[PDB]
Every structure is written in structure tokens, then in C-alpha cells.
């Protein structure tokens, strides 16, 4: 009875969601038709957090799949799990955003939000007590960033006391594949600071780094980077569905890592990620989960936490483990490091223990760390936004949609001050 509505936009948000739902359905014993084929009773007990019961024992997800072109709605529909989605929930337009923010926010996406808000008002009335929403989108595109941050601004005026997570794929300076990347990324970080409650930052050059040096994959596709993200996406909602010795809502994680209302950009991590050659060497205990969780080779964002203080830290464990050993390793990582942790917060790490491990593992964990090393992520964008805009490199696409030049000036000082806001607790 704490339901979660999934919202997913763009090609990036529809190919993450095709793998996230492929992970949850294994976790609850749902085949690609929709019938429960499982071997427990805990799986059927709280399936209503994500699944809507149909007639005949079928379960369909509570997801809305939006896009501005019809090309990514067919590869989703032709995957292994593409026949569980309710066919009305696909909302797709017939002219793309074209890597343009303004068409996503003013011209094309503005004629589509009123045909999406009808859909999300249908899955907000099937819930006896709705917990909150979720968005997966890319900040480097045109319909993940224009329409996606247009939906959040229209959701948050209609359900203003709920929880609105995002899973942002922030652009990387090295792995980049669009010339006009920093215009959309600057004008969307301005749109996330005053309309989300939590925002996990993901860079694609940090997911390639994990798939090259830890899992040692030969050719990581996007399907192996969507599996890394989707293991954290179900690691933060895992006490809403399975019991434990010390639970954690999504609201309880909002309380403990947001000390001030504009500081909610985190960096996720997932603990037992290992190779296939190093599988018989690993010893499978709780101190090995804690050593890898805090590793700076392991964060899903491309900024190093050795360059700043840790404001607050989370940990969401799974499995059957000991509450002495869970609680003595958070104290242990906190007393050696005197100046990696902020001084006016005496205890920084919040722990929770669920009791049911992922399908095929003994135990697992998750990390949601709030650092003042996240403000270097917004300065590589702000050194490339101002290199182009000082000569007006590409503006005639953007101005000719009803958009003014002054929005490129108010979205400079509104991100130049968040860097200074994270800077004032750096020292």
C-alpha cells in the first residue's frame, strides 16, 4: 500500500526501463505473459507496489512510456518482456525533438504533456496510498530533457507533497556524442533544483569504467550498462516490498541526506559487483561489501569523493546478516577519515537492512552518498556552456522557437550559485 508510479522518457529512459522491469519481474516471479510462476509467498505479498492486477491472474506494470518519435516504442515492444506493458501506456509522438531542448519544452513536448497527464492521472487513482513517482531520463538529449523536465514541473504542481525521484544520465565530457550537449544540460539542471526531492546523478563514462575494470567485460553494450543502473533502482525500493530488521522508506532516505533544500544530488553504488575469474576468491561477507561500496572506483558518477567532504551517506543492505557487523563497519569507516566527513554532522551514515536477497545472490548492498565533490560535475558543463555562448555558436535553433537569450543568462547564474552553495560546506 505504498505504490510507485514509473515515468520514463526518451530513448535512454525507455531502454533503462526495459531492463529495470526485466529485473523486477524476475524478482517477483512474473513470466513474459504476466502469470505468477514462483516458489515463495513473499513475492506475491506486496506485488502491488509496482504491479496492477488484471483479470485472470495477470499483472501489468504501473509504468508510463513516453517519447516523441515512434522508433524506440517498437524495440521495447519487441524485446523479451515487451508484451507485459499495457498498450495504452505507450504515448508517442510522430515528430522528434531533434536533439533540441526548445522543441522538447515549448513546441512538440507542450502538445504532448496534456496527453501524458491524462495517463498518469489514471495510475494515480488505482493506488490506495501512493508513495511517489520516478523518472528515468537523459540530460543530454531533446525529449528526455525538454519534455522530461516539463512533466516534473507539471506533476509537482498537482501532487506537491509526494516524492519525486529522478535518475539523471548527466552528459560526460569524454563520452559525448552531441555537439549541442551543454545547452540542454545547463537548462535542465536549472529545472531539477527546485522540482525534485532526490536526484541520483549518473555519467556514462563511469558506467563504462566499471564495466571495463571491475566486471572485465569484453564488449559492454548499452544492455550491460542498463543492468548496472537497474540494480540500484531496485535497491532503494527494497524495504517497501520485503520485510527486514530495520526498514527504510524512500521518505526516510529523503530525511537523512537532505540537510538543506537545494542539496540533493547523489552518487549511487552497488556492492557485490565481481568478474567471472575472481568468483572463487571473494569470501562473501559483510566487510567485503563495505570495502567495495565506499571504493572510488565504484561510484556511478564521474566525480571523485576524495576531492571533498562527505556530507551524508546511506546504505541499504539485503540478506540475512548481523546487526552488530553492519553497525560496526559504518563506525569503522568514519573515525580514520577525519576530514573526509563534515564536522558539524557527528554521525553521517544511515543504515537499513532488508531480509530477502536478489535472485541468485546471498547478500547485497547499495550506497547513496551526498558529497561536495558533485560541484565539479556542474563546472565542466559551465566551462563549455560559456565557451559557446560567448560567441552565440548554435543559438539560432534555440531562439527561433519562442525562446529568448535571457534564459541562457538566468540559467548561468542559477547554476553558478549552486556550485558556490556546495562550496561553502567544502571548507
Amino acid at each position: 500500500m505504498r505504490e510507485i508510479v514509473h515515468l520514463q522518457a526518451g530513448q535512454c529512459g525507455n531502454q533503462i526501463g526495459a531492463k529495470f522491469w526485466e529485473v523486477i519481474s524476475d524478482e517477483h516471479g512474473i513470466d513474459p505473459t504476466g502469470t505468477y510462476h514462483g516458489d515463495s509467498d513473499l513475492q506475491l505479498e506486496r506485488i502491488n507496489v509496482y504491479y496492477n492486477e488484471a483479470t485472470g491472474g495477470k499483472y501489468v506494470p504501473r509504468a508510463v512510456l513516453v517519447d516523441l518519435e515512434p522508433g524506440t516504442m517498437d524495440s521495447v515492444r519487441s524485446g523479451p518482456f515487451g508484451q507485459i506493458f499495457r498498450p495504452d501506456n505507450f504515448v508517442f509522438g510522430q515528430s522528434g525533438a531533434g536533439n533540441n531542448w526548445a522543441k522538447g519544452h515549448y513546441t512538440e513536448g507542450a502538445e504532448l504533456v496534456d496527453s501524458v497527464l491524462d495517463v498518469v492521472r489514471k495510475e494515480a487513482e488505482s493506488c490506495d496510498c501512493l508513495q511517489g513517482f520516478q523518472l528515468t531520463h537523459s540530460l543530454g538529449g531533446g525529449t528526455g530533457s525538454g519534455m522530461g523536465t516539463l512533466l516534473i514541473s507539471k506533476i509537482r504542481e498537482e501532487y506537491p507533497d509526494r516524492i519525486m525521484n529522478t535518475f539523471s544520465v548527466v552528459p560526460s565530457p569524454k563520452v559525448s556524442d552531441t555537439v549541442v550537449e551543454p545547452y540542454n544540460a545547463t537548462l535542465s539542471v536549472h529545472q531539477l533544483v527546485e522540482n525534485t526531492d532526490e536526484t541520483y546523478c549518473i555519467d556514462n563514462e563511469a558506467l563504462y569504467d566499471i564495466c571495463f575494470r571491475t566486471l572485465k567485460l569484453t564488449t559492454p553494450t548499452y544492455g550491460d550498462l542498463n543492468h548496472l543502473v537497474s540494480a540500484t533502482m531496485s535497491g532503494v525500493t527494497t524495504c517497501l516490498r520485503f520485510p527486514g530488521q530495520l526498514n527504510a522508506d524512500l521518505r526516510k532516505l529523503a530525511v537523512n541526506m537532505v540537510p538543506f533544500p537545494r542539496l540533493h544530488f547523489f552518487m549511487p553504488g552497488f556492492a557485490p559487483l565481481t568478474s567471472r575469474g575472481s568468483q572463487q576468491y571473494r569470501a562473501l561477507t559483510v566487510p567485503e561489501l563495505t570495502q567495495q561500496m565506499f571504493d572510488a572506483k565504484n561510484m556511478m558518477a564521474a566525480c571523485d569523493p576524495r576531492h571533498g567532504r562527505y556530507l551524508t551517506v546511506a546504505a541499504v543492505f539485503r540478506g540475512r546478516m548481523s546487526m552488530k557487523e553492519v553497525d560496526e563497519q559504518m563506525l569503522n569507516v568514519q573515525n580514520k577519515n577525519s576530514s573526509y566527513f563534515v564536522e558539524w554532522i557527528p554521525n553521517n551514515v544511515k543504515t537499513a537492512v532488508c531480509d530477502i536477497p536478489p535472485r541468485g545472490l546471498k547478500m547485497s548492498a547499495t550506497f547513496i552518498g551526498n558529497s561536495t565533490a558533485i560541484q565539479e560535475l556542474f563546472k565542466r558543463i559551465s566551462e563549455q556552456f560559456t565557451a559557446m555562448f560567448r560567441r552565440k555558436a548554435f543559438l539560432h535553433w534555440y531562439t527561433g522557437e519562442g525562446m529568448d537569450e535571457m534564459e541562457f543568462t538566468e540559467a548561468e547564474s542559477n547554476m553558478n550559485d549552486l556550485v558556490s552553495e556546495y562550496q561553502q560546506y567544502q571548507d
Binding site: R46, Q245, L246, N247, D249, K252, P261, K324, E343, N347
Partner: protein, 408 residues
């Protein structure tokens, strides 16, 4: 006619009450179905005309997923189905959510079921409230419960068993704000609050018993043993004489707890457990249940509950400081439990001056956060003004000077 209504608020309360009520079922003849396969159960059980025995307890939570395990566990048939009260969304480590917004949806239901339980009992001693300082519901709804029980149930005894926050380990960031904002509003509304913290029981379960890596159940069982030794003279002293003989001044109601033989069955074979041995082992600082030391303070009162068969320095104004009670029934072993089978035990409840360092550390950590105004927006936006931080801090400043003043 010697009943005790128990109230278990929070996940800590429910998971402690599971162990307590298993021990209470097994001490008498009660099966987990509810049938006996004598009337001394009447302090804790009610005898329906259909042969069934129903406990005198109320389990409260704002989250359903720790009471649903009680509803689907082994003791499913024992409990009355509406003595277990659940909300929909929890308090989320927020004293304001647990006091003002969410707890007001459940306070009337809890008071209704408490009134229905108290109408059965002819002679009611008092209530027992099990809670934890750190959580959301156990810090907000518990204080709201005592505030709305003081005006409703007279000058009855309101005993508290609390998990006070441990000196160096905790499972939350936002714990000192709760741990001060609940003490400020339960200072005048309580009679006696025995405080045990999890770190000292971890130390005892590592050191006395040989359980390295314990879980919460090995702690809940020892807490159940202490509560049985407190209430055993009703079944085989009272609850009423505790508040007279432990609380001199009406703001200094914070005693401590100890159980004397907590030893394993592979070391109960090696030693005597005579009355002198267990009495000496009560007053040892390695065996206390709060990580503190009464050498560095001054004793004020002691109650010694025996069951079965110049280093200690007192204050100037209390020379005697001893209440002694004796019971005859030896403690009962549970299968799967870790303590041995013994003939004698002692439980000592001692009020001391050496708990001033705990409030000094709590005030230090509250100051460390609140001087830079961290985490305040959560507490302000949920129907709670900002100035209550200032009043709670100056009130606990008065409490520290009280602990110094009585010692001088």
C-alpha cells in the same frame, strides 16, 4: 486482579514484545494457539469463556510490515486481531511526522483500545511503555501517547523501557534531535524510565555469553528476562514502590538496569552462583546495560530484586539507598535461548549521578548540528515551529545543572 497493560510502540517495541510474550506464554502453560493443555496468568492474560487466553497488550506502529509478520507468524492465533494497530506511511525518522501529522491519525484508536483493555482489569497497577528514542514513531507518537495518557489515566504508574541512544554507534543521522525533543516533552509526564542501550548489551553478549555477531533477538530475550524479574512478585514488591524508592526529585527519573547471572551453559558448570557472587556482579561496571561508569559519579538509589532460592560511594543526603525484594520462582529457560538454567538471579535498578555524561554528549551533538541549522527544514515544514529547538536545548541545560546541583 494485579494486571499490567503493556503498550509496544515502534519496531523496537514490537520486536521486543514478541520475545517478552513468548516468555510469558511459556512461563505459564499457554500454548501459542491460546489453550492450556490455577489463575496466576491473570496479571497478563484474559480468560475467554471459549477457553482462550488473550494478552493485555497493544502493539502500535505507523508502518504495517513489522506487524504483518506477527499476523502471519507462529503466534497468529494468540493475539486479538485488533490489538495490533498499523498505519500506512511511517514517520520516517521525523519527530514532527510522528507527533503532529501522522500520529494524530492513530492516537484516538490507541486510546480507544487502551480503554477497552483497562475496563476488564479490576485492580490495575500501571502501564509499561516500550520504545526507542531514535526512531520516528518511538520518539514522537510515544511522547504524544504519554501526553494524552497523563490527563486520562490519573496518577497511575507509567513505567518506560527505553532504548537510549548508544554513545558511539547509531543507525541514523538525525537521532539527537529526536533524542532531545522527546526528553523535553516527556520529562514531566513519566514516572520511571529504565534505559538500556544496544551497545552495552552487544558487549555483554560478546563477553559474558560467547555470542560473537549477535542479532536483535539475542538482545530482546535478555530484555524479556529483566521485565519478567521486575513483574515476577505479582505472579509468584509491586510496580508502585519503584517510583517511590528510585525517584527522589521529580525530574531525575532515569535509573539503570542489570541482570546478575548472564552466563552460558558451558560456564555455568564451572562455578557457584551464590547470592554474594551475583550481588557483587550487579555492581560491576562491565555488567551494566549502559556504556557508562558509576565510579565516576555518585549513587543515589538501588533496588535489588532477587529471584529463586569504598569503591561504591553514595551521595551526601541519601545514606541508606537500598530496597530489597525476594521472589521464590527461579527463572524459566526458553528453547533456543542462550542463557543457562540457574537457581538464583538478581535484577538491580539504580539511580546514579554518573549519567550526566550521556546528556552532555547528547547536548554536544545537538549543538554541533543545530548551530549550522542542518536538517531543520524537515522539522519546520511538518507543522512544528523552529523555537522548540531553543526551548529544548535550554531545558536540557537546566537538566545538566540539576545533575550537578544534586551531586554538590
Amino acid at each position: 486482579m494485579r494486571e499490567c497493560i503493556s503498550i509496544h510502540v515502534g519496531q523496537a517495541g514490537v520486536q521486543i514484545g514478541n520475545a517478552c510474550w513468548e516468555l510469558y506464554c511459556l512461563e505459564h502453560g499457554i500454548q501459542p494457539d491460546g489453550q492450556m493443555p490455577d489463575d496466576s496468568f491473570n496479571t497478563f492474560f484474559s480468560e475467554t469463556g471459549a477457553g482462550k487466553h488473550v494478552p493485555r497488550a497493544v502493539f502500535v506502529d505507523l508502518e504495517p510490515t513489522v506487524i504483518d509478520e506477527v499476523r502471519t507468524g507462529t503466534y497468529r492465533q494468540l493475539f486479538h486481531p485488533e490489538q495490533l494497530i498499523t498505519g500506512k506511511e511511517d514517520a520516517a525518522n521525523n519527530y514532527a511526522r510522528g507527533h503532529y501529522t501522522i500520529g494524530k491519525e492513530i492516537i484516538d484508536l490507541v486510546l480507544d483500545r487502551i480503554r477497552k483493555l483497562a475496563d476488564q482489569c479490576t485492580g490495575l497497577q500501571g502501564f509499561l511503555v516500550f520504545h526507542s528514542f531514535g526512531g520516528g514513531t518511538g520518539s514522537g507518537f510515544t511522547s504524544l501517547l504519554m501526553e494524552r495518557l497523563s490527563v486520562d489515566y490519573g496518577k497511575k504508574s507509567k513505567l518506560e523501557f527505553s532504548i537510549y541512544p548508544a554513545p558511539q554507534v547509531s543507525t541514523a543521522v538525525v537521532e539527537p534531535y529526536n533524542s532531545i525533543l522527546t526528553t523535553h516533552t516527556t520529562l514531566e509526564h513519566s514516572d520511571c524510565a529504565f534505559m538500556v542501550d544496544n551497545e552495552a548489551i552487544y558487549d555483554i553478549c560478546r563477553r559474558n555469553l560467547d555470542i560473537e555477531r549477535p542479532t536483535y533477538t539475542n538482545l530482546n530475550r535478555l530484555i524479556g528476562q529483566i521485565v519478567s524479574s521486575i513483574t515476577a512478585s505479582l505472579r509468584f514488591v509491586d510496580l508502585t514502590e519503584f517510583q517511590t524508592n528510585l525517584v527522589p526529585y521529580p525530574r531525575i527519573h532515569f535509573p539503570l538496569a542489570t541482570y546478575a547471572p548472564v552466563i552460558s551453559a558451558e560456564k555455568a558448570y564451572h562455578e557457584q552462583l551464590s547470592v554474594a557472587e551475583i550481588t557483587n556482579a550487579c555492581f560491576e561496571p562491565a555488567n551494566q546495560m549502559v556504556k557508562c561508569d558509576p565510579r565516576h559519579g555518585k549513587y543515589m538509589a538501588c533496588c535489588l530484586l532477587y529471584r529463586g532460592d569504598r569503591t561504591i560511594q553514595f551521595v551526601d543526603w541519601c545514606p541508606t539507598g537500598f530496597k530489597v525484594g525476594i521472589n521464590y520462582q527461579p527463572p524459566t529457560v526458553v528453547p533456543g535461548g542462550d542463557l543457562a538454567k540457574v537457581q538464583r538471579a538478581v535484577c538491580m535498578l539504580s539511580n546514579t549521578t554518573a549519567i550526566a555524561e550521556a546528556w552532555a554528549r547528547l547536548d554536544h551533538k545537538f549543538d554541533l548540528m543545530y548551530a549550522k541549522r542542518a536538517f531543520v527544514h524537515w522539522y519546520v515544514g511538518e507543522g512544528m515551529e523552529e523555537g522548540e529547538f531553543s526551548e529544548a536545548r535550554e531545558d536540557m541545560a537546566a537538566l545538566e545543572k540539576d545533575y550537578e546541583e544534586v551531586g554538590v
